[PDB]
Design a binder for this molecule. Sequence first.
Ligand SMILES: *[C@@H]1O[C@H](CO)[C@@H](O[C@@H]2O[C@H](CO)[C@@H](O)[C@H](O)[C@@H]2O)[C@H](O)[C@H]1NC(C)=O
Ligand SMILES: *[C@@H]1O[C@H](CO)[C@@H](O[C@@H]2O[C@H](CO)[C@@H](O)[C@H](O)[C@@H]2O)[C@H](O)[C@H]1NC(C)=O
Ligand SMILES: *[C@@H]1O[C@H](CO)[C@@H](O[C@@H]2O[C@H](CO)[C@@H](O)[C@H](O)[C@@H]2O)[C@H](O)[C@H]1NC(C)=O
Ligand SMILES: *[C@@H]1O[C@H](CO)[C@@H](O[C@@H]2O[C@H](CO)[C@@H](O)[C@H](O)[C@@H]2O)[C@H](O)[C@H]1NC(C)=O
Ligand SMILES: *[C@@H]1O[C@H](CO)[C@@H](O[C@@H]2O[C@H](CO)[C@@H](O)[C@H](O)[C@@H]2O)[C@H](O)[C@H]1NC(C)=O
Ligand SMILES: *[C@@H]1O[C@H](CO)[C@@H](O)[C@H](O)[C@H]1NC(C)=O
Ligand SMILES: *[C@@H]1O[C@H](CO)[C@@H](O)[C@H](O)[C@H]1NC(C)=O
Ligand SMILES: *[C@@H]1O[C@H](CO)[C@@H](O)[C@H](O)[C@H]1NC(C)=O
Ligand SMILES: *[C@@H]1O[C@H](CO)[C@@H](O)[C@H](O)[C@H]1NC(C)=O
Ligand SMILES: *[C@@H]1O[C@H](CO)[C@@H](O)[C@H](O)[C@H]1NC(C)=O
Ligand SMILES: *[C@@H]1O[C@H](CO)[C@@H](O)[C@H](O)[C@H]1NC(C)=O
Ligand SMILES: *[C@@H]1O[C@H](CO)[C@@H](O)[C@H](O)[C@H]1NC(C)=O
Ligand SMILES: *[C@@H]1O[C@H](CO)[C@@H](O)[C@H](O)[C@H]1NC(C)=O
Ligand SMILES: *[C@@H]1O[C@H](CO)[C@@H](O)[C@H](O)[C@H]1NC(C)=O
Ligand SMILES: *[C@@H]1O[C@H](CO)[C@@H](O)[C@H](O)[C@H]1NC(C)=O
Ligand SMILES: *[C@@H]1O[C@H](CO)[C@@H](O)[C@H](O)[C@H]1NC(C)=O
Lengths: 339, 182, 338, 177, 48
Amino acid sequence: VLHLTQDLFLPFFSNVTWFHAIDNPVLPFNDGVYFASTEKSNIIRGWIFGTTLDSKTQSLLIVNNATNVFIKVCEFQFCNDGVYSSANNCTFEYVSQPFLMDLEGKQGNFKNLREFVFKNIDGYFKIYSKHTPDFPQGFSALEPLVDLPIGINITRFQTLLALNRADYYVGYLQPRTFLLKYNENGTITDAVDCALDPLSETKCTLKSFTVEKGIYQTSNFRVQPTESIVRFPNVTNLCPFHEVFNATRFASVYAWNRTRISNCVADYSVLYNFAPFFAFKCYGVSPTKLNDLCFTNVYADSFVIKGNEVSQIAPGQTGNIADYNYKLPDDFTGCVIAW
Amino acid sequence: VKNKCVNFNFNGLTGTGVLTKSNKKFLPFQQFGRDIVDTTDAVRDPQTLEILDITPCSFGGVSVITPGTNTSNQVAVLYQGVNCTEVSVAIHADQLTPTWRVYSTGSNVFQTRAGCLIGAEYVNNSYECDIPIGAGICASYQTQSQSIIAYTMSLGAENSVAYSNNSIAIPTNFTISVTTEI
Amino acid sequence: LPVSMTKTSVDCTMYICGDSTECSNLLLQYGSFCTQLKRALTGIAVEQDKNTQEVFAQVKQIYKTPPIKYFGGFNFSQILPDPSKPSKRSPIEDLLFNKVTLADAGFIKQYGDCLGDIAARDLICAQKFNGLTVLPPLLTDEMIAQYTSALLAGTITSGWTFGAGPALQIPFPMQMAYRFNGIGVTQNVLYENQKLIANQFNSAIGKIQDSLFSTPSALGKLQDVVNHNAQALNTLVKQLSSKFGAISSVLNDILSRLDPPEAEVQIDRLITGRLQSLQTYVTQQLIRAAEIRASANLAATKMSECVLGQSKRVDFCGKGYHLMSFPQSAPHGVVFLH
Amino acid sequence: SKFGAISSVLNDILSRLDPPEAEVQIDRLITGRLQSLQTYVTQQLIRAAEIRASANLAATKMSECVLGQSKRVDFCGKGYHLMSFPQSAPHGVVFLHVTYVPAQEKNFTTAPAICHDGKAHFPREGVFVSNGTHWFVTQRNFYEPQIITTDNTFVSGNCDVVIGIVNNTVYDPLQLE
Amino acid sequence: LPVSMTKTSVDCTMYICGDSTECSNLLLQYGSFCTQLKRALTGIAVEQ
Ligand SMILES: *[C@@H]1O[C@H](CO)[C@@H](O[C@@H]2O[C@H](CO)[C@@H](O)[C@H](O)[C@@H]2O)[C@H](O)[C@H]1NC(C)=O
Ligand SMILES: *[C@@H]1O[C@H](CO)[C@@H](O[C@@H]2O[C@H](CO)[C@@H](O)[C@H](O)[C@@H]2O)[C@H](O)[C@H]1NC(C)=O
Ligand SMILES: *[C@@H]1O[C@H](CO)[C@@H](O[C@@H]2O[C@H](CO)[C@@H](O)[C@H](O)[C@@H]2O)[C@H](O)[C@H]1NC(C)=O
Ligand SMILES: *[C@@H]1O[C@H](CO)[C@@H](O[C@@H]2O[C@H](CO)[C@@H](O)[C@H](O)[C@@H]2O)[C@H](O)[C@H]1NC(C)=O
Ligand SMILES: *[C@@H]1O[C@H](CO)[C@@H](O[C@@H]2O[C@H](CO)[C@@H](O)[C@H](O)[C@@H]2O)[C@H](O)[C@H]1NC(C)=O
Ligand SMILES: *[C@@H]1O[C@H](CO)[C@@H](O)[C@H](O)[C@H]1NC(C)=O
Ligand SMILES: *[C@@H]1O[C@H](CO)[C@@H](O)[C@H](O)[C@H]1NC(C)=O
Ligand SMILES: *[C@@H]1O[C@H](CO)[C@@H](O)[C@H](O)[C@H]1NC(C)=O
Ligand SMILES: *[C@@H]1O[C@H](CO)[C@@H](O)[C@H](O)[C@H]1NC(C)=O
Ligand SMILES: *[C@@H]1O[C@H](CO)[C@@H](O)[C@H](O)[C@H]1NC(C)=O
Ligand SMILES: *[C@@H]1O[C@H](CO)[C@@H](O)[C@H](O)[C@H]1NC(C)=O
Ligand SMILES: *[C@@H]1O[C@H](CO)[C@@H](O)[C@H](O)[C@H]1NC(C)=O
Ligand SMILES: *[C@@H]1O[C@H](CO)[C@@H](O)[C@H](O)[C@H]1NC(C)=O
Ligand SMILES: *[C@@H]1O[C@H](CO)[C@@H](O)[C@H](O)[C@H]1NC(C)=O
Ligand SMILES: *[C@@H]1O[C@H](CO)[C@@H](O)[C@H](O)[C@H]1NC(C)=O
Ligand SMILES: *[C@@H]1O[C@H](CO)[C@@H](O)[C@H](O)[C@H]1NC(C)=O
């Protein structure tokens, strides 16, 4: 079969960042990391994942050793080099067979190449590997080992080292359509991308590794917009907010003066710059998300009271000013002003 | 901003189109402009009170022309129904949807009536059509040492009858031929 | 006789979900449903090209008329190519080409003047805005005239021999003598009334152009073909403004108004309606293609039998006893002069 | 395909939802499968019609080319038709049209008629051919030069109306004997 | 040999929504899904 799938895959003939060793940059993670390394026996011990690399967000530990693994997702504080110093609120402990397979035919010339690919789509930390005993051209698929639902945040990826007394072919995966040819016994002998070269999509469109002579309508091209303008009508017609907030004979509380507000555009910067203010307790409307709301009618009542009566004015209260002069309904939605 | 594919959101009318100057006769009470098939055509700018058209950004199709993969691996790309000057500039600014990029060596640019072909060269000879491209143009894989050319198809071998007012030709032999129909 | 129809390559996602990632994603769930429509349209296009090939490319060699035009007094100027005209077409070809108007030429590259349309953008620009395109014919309207000229200049200088094997020359009076002999009346009558037959031939050729010029519509068949195709395209475009039983008829404002997890139903109803409309368009196009294919097969047979030889089956190549026929090219068709 | 439903396996959606809501989901899959079946059957009808047209053409070709020889041009192969043989193929038929094609030709000369003594003589079948020096009679599709005899030339005319007429003598086997 | 067939003239409004204004209004939202059918039937009749 020639199954064509759509999943996070490392782009073909894309560049991969080949490092050396002898200080271990913390490479990013986005939509997967392809890994590769060729070595004599062993120089890589463990991996750590996540964001901020500290004891505040969750990170990952999959460190190997001579015989087993140490799969865990915890909140390790720091190592700077005995790989952790914090395991207070940490769980998800798992143990299995070691990931590293090394075989030699009585000689070290069999430098097995270790390609690794992982992902965290909808969490579920998938782990794969394959060892094949510059960069080989012959294809090699990858076999899964462990599939665990972590469900945490991943942004950066790190690799640990080993001790001693050429590797790091690091790539990234993206959402890509791939076409894979499967053997009759179930191995993968080849793969071809679908968004790299015209011939590649020419093969993917007919899903055939051999294309006869001809001309094939493959896809559709479209000039994506250069920029994005948004344009809305003109604005004007402000309210008498200056005329209601700068009067001279604000009436007493026993007869609270009411001003009706209509037919305007609502400038709300004046509600901010006017006076250093003393109380801005809004109840039903967010004090910053108020310019994005549309109202039919608005009332403004202005009067003078003492200091304690200012804090007394609130939904569901008591006292001589909230029970004999002015009452505010419990389901009131708006903002109060006091300076 | 004008003369560029730009995402507009005119007074709630979301869409993508090339905007430019127009010579409509929008009456004082008019805002929109439509067609017989009811598509928003010209929009009077609310803060410019001018007339500005809307046009498809660059709707087309891509066809890849190639000989058999067992013979060679090279390909050429044709963009359906668009002067490649626009696609050329669009490639140069990197805003085409296809991410695959075919080479532009200058010798591979041909403005057909079916679009414009990129990746093949124009020889002016005439041969039997092999790969039908469109509008009287054919392409083929031919040894130079091998590449893909563009040419105009030949309708057939050029011949002229020798008509005269008192001359006839009469066959002195024959042949028998066996064809086949399926 | 019509021979071919305009060739179209509608594309699903651009038609059905204007540059909307979520709408394309939900369209993807229906499987390879619209893939059939594409393959079907490609088959239609290839069939059109094949129809033109079979009808016109009946001769492998392009013959040319002799420099002089005196075939025993017979007048063929009205049908042979006219050098003065830049398109190199006979006057009968010119009347036919001037009496037929095409809604969508296709070989115009109209992109670039839709922004410059000044007035309301026309049918072509309106269609192109919703992912609907028209491809150009493989054989231009010019080399079809060259094929017709070769066929015409082979008939009048070699008889019917060029249709069987090598072309052998023979004077036109002797060719007409044998054509007379084929209908049961001896060559004597032609060799006696050569002048009368020449004069009648001329008069008929003269009056056919008047009959074509003065009539309101004698080219109704090709015009109906063009009108039907254009009307189908217009009724396909007009369906994108139909509400189909949802909140709105436009994806761009349906997505900008409602969130994914509740606008899913609205996008689904729009998908169903638009998919069914595209299905209907494709099916009608398939049926019309079958009809045009039958007509093109008949035209190819008529050319092969009436032009490269004279037919004995009655009322096939015109009313009466058949003598000759001459082909003329027309937009998306052919015209015979029996 | 899910067709806008929860899953594309009828049994799978059953064990995870209540019957009424499951029924709602169930309809979506049925409608999609139905529309699929409608598409399949309609395209099959189109294909069957085109195959029937081809089969009718094959029957006519068999009857006319195989059970006789036809005068229709370019029908049973290119050239002058002689025979045809049928062969069987999977889901079809194959014909073997045997035709007669002329060969090497020579410009000779010609004459509409020949005026021996005041009368125009015409070839019953064939053309009048002059080698360049002597006049003869022959067929059209093959060159068999034959002496000019009245047995091949009927007489009707007056030697004054034939444009391009030429001159020679005609022969008769009757005056000799 | 058959030469022709009967000429039917179905009408979508009454077929789908038997004299009901609400159903007529609801059917009005599905576009021009009726004029095409009427045109096809008329063409078939003229062809016969
Ligand atoms: C799939 O697996 C089969 C069994 O292992 C392979 O067949 C084998 O072939 C080997 C020689 O290659 C024999 O020695 C053995 O007896 C058995 O028949 C088969 O080849 C394999 N498929 C492949 C490799 O593509
Ligand atoms: C007519 O044309 C025939 C070919 O179609 C000629 O037959 C050839 O004869 C030669 C020997 O003369 C063979 O060697 C050759 O294979 C072929 O059969 C035939 O001679 C020719 N006749 C005349 C009179 O021109
Ligand atoms: C053969 O038919 C031609 C058709 O174009 C005749 O040409 C005509 O030329 C005259 C002037 O010479 C024009 O006034 C007329 O409109 C037409 O083009 C041509 O004379 C005619 N001649 C013979 C010998 O029949
Ligand atoms: C005229 O046609 C004659 C055909 O019969 C040719 O004459 C031949 O000449 C030879 C000797 O020259 C005779 O022996 C033979 O019987 C035959 O008559 C002759 O070639 C031809 N002339 C021309 C000019 O074509
Ligand atoms: C064939 O021979 C005829 C006589 O046998 C010719 O007729 C002659 O015509 C001339 C004038 O052309 C008269 O003066 C003479 O009396 C006789 O009628 C005839 O022309 C000739 N034809 C050709 C084509 O040479
Ligand atoms: C990888 O990076 C190099 C720059 O070092 C760049 O030239 C190359 O194009 C990149 N790879 C791809 C596939 O673009
Ligand atoms: C290796 O890791 C496993 C993981 O549980 C641990 O039990 C073991 O002690 C470690 N050391 C060796 C030598 O296996
Ligand atoms: C684990 O997190 C909880 C969160 O409320 C906190 O109360 C507790 O102290 C944490 N455990 C530690 C820090 O060991
Ligand atoms: C993961 O981290 C990035 C940046 O640190 C942040 O934007 C995002 O919301 C985080 N995701 C979750 C699920 O916390
Ligand atoms: C009220 O208005 C007067 C002038 O009209 C101005 O001087 C004064 O500053 C205003 N009051 C406040 C609090 O700004
Ligand atoms: C507010 O005070 C002004 C002036 O004293 C008066 O005209 C108006 O009626 C008052 N509005 C009230 C009490 O609602
Ligand atoms: C929009 O308002 C601004 C500010 O009043 C003004 O300068 C501009 O001319 C207005 N535009 C139109 C088209 O009214
Ligand atoms: C597209 O074609 C050419 C090539 O640049 C140019 O004249 C113009 O941009 C367009 N022409 C038309 C007729 O639209
Ligand atoms: C040769 O080809 C060029 C295009 O490469 C064309 O412009 C020119 O007319 C051709 N000349 C001949 C004689 O065919
Ligand atoms: C044949 O004769 C006519 C009449 O004299 C003449 O006009 C014509 O040119 C001749 N044909 C040729 C090929 O010379
Ligand atoms: C007759 O002679 C002409 C002289 O140009 C020649 O072109 C033609 O081929 C000849 N006819 C034949 C050989 O049948």
